[PDB]
């Protein structure tokens, strides 16, 4: 019975020593988990803000691109209208000079 | 009898200690697993944030350049509207002089 | 013999008890996690319903705005046309007037 | 055999205490497994709602952004329509004035 008491005390000591270490580790892990869970929540807030800014910038860039192309088209049409109006001027000048020449003959 | 009660007391206390150990080992494994899942979500969100922040800078840069083009086209459009208004006015004056000479030639 | 059975039972009892306290410990944390998850779920449900509602209202507004834009574009082209034609009538009256002025001058 | 009765009672007492403990353990394991299941279901719903919410929130921002840009176009077009109405009103008025001046010149030329 004396040998049994010794064997059990011995097994209990080993088990309890292991237990105190495991209780420390559970406490350590619960703490790290709380910290990671907080960082995760924080990164989610920051990501949502950054993703929001991307969408706003995407819409601005797409709208700006449309404006540029609309203005490009309008500039082309204006260049054409100006070239044609100046050409009508030049033609009127020549027709006037020709009518003056016709009239001179008398 | 007093020695028999000690063995029974130690056996019971050993069983309780072992049961606590079996449980603590399971909980440590449960917590370690959760920790690497949380650690992975954190690392993932960091990658995604860095990419989103990068995309914002690229879009800010593009939006600023596009904004410059828009205003330099607006300025050019204004100058073209002006040139056209003035040229059309010179045309209209030439048309009046030509129409007048046509009328004089007719009579 | 019977004393070894007593030792065997006491050890098994302690282990069973220890396991039981571990489950009591577990149930409690599970009840807590459940309450937290249930609350996040309720919150997300509210937010989703609101966001889905806002999507419908924005889709409706975007579609109506698109109609206006196209109606205005159609009206702009009809006004451009009317202006082009009216200016052409002007130019023709301006030529007729300049012609009459020239005819009067020679007489 | 008086000691055997005292030892026999212990075995009996401990056996019944073990069975009862073993039984309580099976009930507690059912509650842990009932709660673990509900937790998994709730955790899954949460993850699902987060995906859906992120998508819906994204769509809201894109639509808000589009509606603001469309509103700018509408107002730019309204301004341009007003300027065109004015140009047209003025051109038609110049026409009417040229018609009157022409009719006058025709009348003077006749006399």
Numbering used by the authors:
A (entry chain F): 9 to 114
B (entry chain E): 7 to 113
C (entry chain A): 8 to 114
D (entry chain D): 3 to 113
The authors write:
Centrioles have proximal-distal polarity and a 9-fold radial symmetry imparted by a likewise symmetrical central scaffold, the cartwheel. The spindle assembly abnormal protein 6 (SAS-6) self-assembles into 9-fold radially symmetric ring-shaped oligomers that stack via an unknown mechanism to form the cartwheel. SAS-6 proteins comprise a globular “head” domain at their N-terminus followed by a long coiled coil that mediates stable protein homo-dimerization (Keller et al., 2014), and a disordered C-terminal extension. The characteristic shape of the SAS-6 ring led to the proposal that the protein head domains comprise the central “hub” of the centriolar cartwheel, with SAS-6 coiled coils forming the cartwheel “spokes” (Cottee et al., 2015; Kitagawa et al., 2011; van Breugel et al., 2011; van Breugel et al., 2014; Yoshiba et al., 2019).
In contrast, structures of the CrSAS-6_CCMiddle fragment, resolved from two different crystal forms, revealed parallel complexes featuring extensive interaction interfaces between coiled-coil domains, within each crystal’s asymmetric unit. CrSAS-6_CCMiddle form II, resolved to 2.43 Å using one copy of the CrSAS-6_CCMiddle coiled coil from form I as molecular replacement model, featured four copies of the coiled-coil domain per asymmetric unit. Of these, two copies were arranged in a symmetric-interacting fashion identical to the form I complex. In striking contrast, the remaining two CrSAS-6 coiled-coil copies formed a parallel but distinctly asymmetric complex driven by hydrogen-bonding and ionic interactions, which buried ∼1,700 Å2 of solvent-accessible surface. The symmetry break was caused by an ∼8-Å shift between the two coiled-coil copies, resulting from a 5-Å translation along the coiled-coil length and a 35° relative rotation. The contact interface of the asymmetric CrSAS-6 coiled-coil complex overlapped to a great extent with that of the symmetric complex, but also involved additional amino acid residues; a comparison of amino acids at the two interfaces is shown in Figure S2B. Hydrophobic contacts were limited to packing of the H294 side chain against G297′ and G301ʹ (prime denotes amino acids of the second coiled-coil copy in the complex), which form part of a GxxxG motif known for mediating interactions between α-helices (Kleiger et al., 2002), and sidechain interactions between A340-A336ʹ and V351 with the aliphatic part of S347ʹ. Specifically, we substituted residues V351E/D361N (CrSAS-6_CCVD), thereby abrogating a mild hydrophobic (V351-S347′) and an ionic (R367-D361′) contact of the asymmetric interface. Although CrSAS-6VD did form cartwheels, they were less abundant and less apparent compared with those formed by the WT protein, suggesting reduced stacking propensity.
